């Protein structure tokens, strides 16, 4: 019986228990894939499974921010190619004098008066 | 031969089966990895794996999008600081009466006429 | 003896080993857990864990940039708003002639000389 009880004993050593063996490897598994906390800081606290769900759930929260703001910057570029388009006139001449408008130009109103 | 029959009995309820023991906590932890359905709504269904692969391709995604607009704006804070620094002149009174262009001020044409 | 060396065999064949049985499906876990390089390319190369980890901080970037350019855009539109509602007058016709500024129309300086 001597060889039973010693194949024995090493498949006990080898299932092991929470601390060891297979039985160790697998409680460990177990703790990282749930987690200690969920509330938790750390991804290893929260447990692989809460943090992927977790990541998810900002990539969508985020990519919804970036979808709005692709829009307003899309008026945005309108708004200034109108405001480019519009041909205004900036100011005349600061001089003590007097200026009227002709072909692009400002010119002395005492040229005419 | 009891003792071994015990202690042979007690190692197979420990390694269990697919639905229990130290079989069946690997068997989900290799069910929650893999995943169920791989095009599946879930991240249990997609299986851990999968959807850390999704989340890493989506925030690669959103990035690109999001340099490309911040490059979209720095053309745009340009083309208003442009516009800004052009010194356009707003609209004249409108008050039935002629004006022209003197000193930032607008002056009643009249007055040297 | 021959049906506890029976059983005896069969859970050895079970429990395995690190290529096959129980073991082997641990070893696996594991590896995919940990990962094989950390500074690899693949999810499966850095593993379950550090693959979770890294997305989380560039979810986080992104969400950074995400919340200034929000900021500058705003900035953008009131800018843009201004410049629409401070009343700037487009060019007056280019043909020769001098125009002065009545009730948002430019009429010919003429009219008055
Ligand atoms: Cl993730
Ligand atoms: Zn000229
Ligand atoms: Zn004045
Ligand atoms: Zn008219």
Redesign the interface.
């Known amino acids: 019986?001597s060889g039973?009880?010693n194949?024995?004993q090493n498949?006990?050593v080898?299932?092991g228990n929470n601390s060891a063996g297979?039985?160790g490897?697998?409680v460990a598994?177990?703790t990282?894939?749930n987690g200690t906390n969920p509330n938790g800081s750390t991804?290893?606290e929260r447990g692989?499974?809460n943090?992927?769900?977790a990541?998810?759930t900002?990539?969508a929260s985020?990519?919804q921010?970036?979808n709005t703001?692709?829009g307003?910057?899309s008026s945005?570029?309108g708004?200034?190619q109108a405001?480019?388009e519009?041909?205004?006139?900036?100011?005349?001449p600061?001089?003590?004098?007097?200026?009227?408008?002709?072909?692009?130009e400002?010119?002395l109103?005492?040229t005419?008066?």
Request: net charge negative.
């Open positions: 019986v039973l009880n194949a024995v498949l006990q080898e299932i297979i039985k490897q697998v598994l177990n990282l894939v991804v290893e692989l499974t943090s992927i769900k990541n998810e900002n990539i985020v990519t921010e970036v703001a692709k307003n910057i945005l570029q708004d200034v405001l480019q519009a041909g205004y006139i900036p100011e005349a600061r001089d003590g004098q007097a200026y009227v408008r002709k072909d692009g400002w010119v109103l005492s005419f008066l």
